[PDB]
């Protein structure tokens, strides 16, 4: 996260770190959506151009974390994966359309002050909150700069959703309805973006109707980090909800 701030303790209790077992390193963000299911970006797990194709055994899920690098004894919970599910129409060849995946945990994670699931939006949630100018929140342990540092603690940044024509005019990538973009314009004088290592984490909003947090997006891609006139792009969770529902009721908790 570029130009964000340190999270508060327990600020984003659905935050999940995807951690590579060997070498030991941060692979991506992710979010906790139930006691056995975790949501992330497909390209965190499968991305042929970079020779990335992780299997269940290659990673761990770390939940309830704050510090990036420390083993947060008695606070964080480390979970093994039972099975990974990538969207069958994920488009890794061109534009990361449908950049979404689920991971089922081998065992249920116990909730605590630091570990709690985020809500997934229903159609009305999305219609009312996903509007240009409404701000969401992005969180992650990714890079602090496009090129250099790395954070000590979870970072947070609030960013406005951008009009679809402005998103489209900022990029040469083909944008689909499964994506949305967020960030400030040059004239707005505020900054912030996701960066390398933030992919898969959540873009969340707090409904003013029911006071609950909903995960509207997944950090997917961006042309650099926090560049003027560029914006971050997020998977549109509500548009892919039928797919989410289908894999959880066919296979899960």
């Amino acid at each position: 996260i570029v130009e964000g701030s340190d999270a508060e303790i327990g600020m984003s209790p659905w935050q999940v770190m995807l951690f590579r077992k060997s070498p030991q390193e941060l692979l991506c963000g992710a979010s906790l959506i139930s006691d056995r299911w975790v949501l992330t970006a497909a390209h965190c797990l499968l991305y042929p151009p970079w020779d990335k194709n992780f299997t269940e055994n290659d990673l761990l899920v770390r939940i309830g974390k704050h510090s990036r690098t420390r083993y947060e004894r008695n606070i964080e919970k480390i979970s093994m994966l039972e099975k990974i599910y990538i969207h069958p129409r994920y488009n890794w060849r061109e534009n990361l359309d449908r950049d979404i995946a689920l991971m089922k945990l081998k065992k249920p994670v116990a909730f605590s002050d630091y570990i709690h699931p985020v809500c997934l939006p229903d159609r009305e949630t999305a219609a009312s909150l996903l509007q240009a100018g409404y701000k969401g929140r992005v969180t992650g342990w990714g890079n602090l700069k496009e090129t250099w540092g790395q954070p000590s603690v979870l970072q947070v940044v609030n960013l406005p959703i951008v009009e679809r024509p402005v998103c489209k005019d900022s990029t040469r990538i083909r944008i689909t309805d499964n994506m949305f973009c967020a960030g400030y314009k040059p004239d707005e004088g505020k900054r912030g973006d996701a960066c390398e290592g933030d992919s898969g984490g959540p873009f969340v909003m707090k409904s003013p109707f029911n006071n609950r947090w909903y995960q509207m997006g997944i950090v997917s891609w961006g042309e650099g980090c926090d560049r003027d006139g560029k914006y971050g792009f997020y998977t549109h969770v509500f548009r892919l909800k039928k797919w989410i529902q289908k894999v959880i009721d066919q296979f899960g908790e």
């Binding site: 951690f19 030991q24 390193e25 941060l26 761990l60 690098t69 420390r70 083993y71 480390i78 093994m80």
Partner: peptide, 10 residues
Amino acid sequence: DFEEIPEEYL
């Protein structure tokens, strides 16, 4: 750079 995690998880 990452602190060792208990071997029960690895």
